[PDB]
Amino acid sequence: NRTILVPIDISDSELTQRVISHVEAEAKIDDAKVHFLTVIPSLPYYASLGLASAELPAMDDLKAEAKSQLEAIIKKFNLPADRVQAHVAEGSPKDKILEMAKKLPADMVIIASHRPDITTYLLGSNAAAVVDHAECSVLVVR
Template structure:
């Protein structure tokens, strides 16, 4: 399982590197945390213009957005792009 996590992290870091290459105005952050709580600590310190967050397929309890994505959308002070 640790090998899968390491490979996934490596692939995400490569994607981020490719997306932010030649774009000094872009900053990325890859964190393993509970978004509802960890998210609030950094946007006020870093002036973000947009937040991109993943969401899972909805179930009956979170039909429109995942609960983490919904919390970010409700409370963010900038644009939020939710990717499924």
């Protein structure tokens, strides 16, 4: 049975809606195991300003909260309880997505292109890197 990785930005509503049907259809093929991953971004820029368990809340705290929101989001998908798993990481979202894709390993990554906006973007920062560097199939959802 295949493995599908579904990266979720917990701050995105519309994106999460569009991937739901795709994720559901994809898992109904092969009875796939679906792994959801949300990544707490860590910015060098903020570090360089001095903003660190100090001016920013504890990482253990942030993770529990992110994980909490991810599990709320996973309830929006019709997937067998036995086939789903939630993951939280910290770092560059693209690197951690790609790392998780190597770790599982993933047969497919399902990822939204970019938040809907009035800019003329192609792919988002993270979608483009995943598409480019993943070693498995990537479904870019629009």
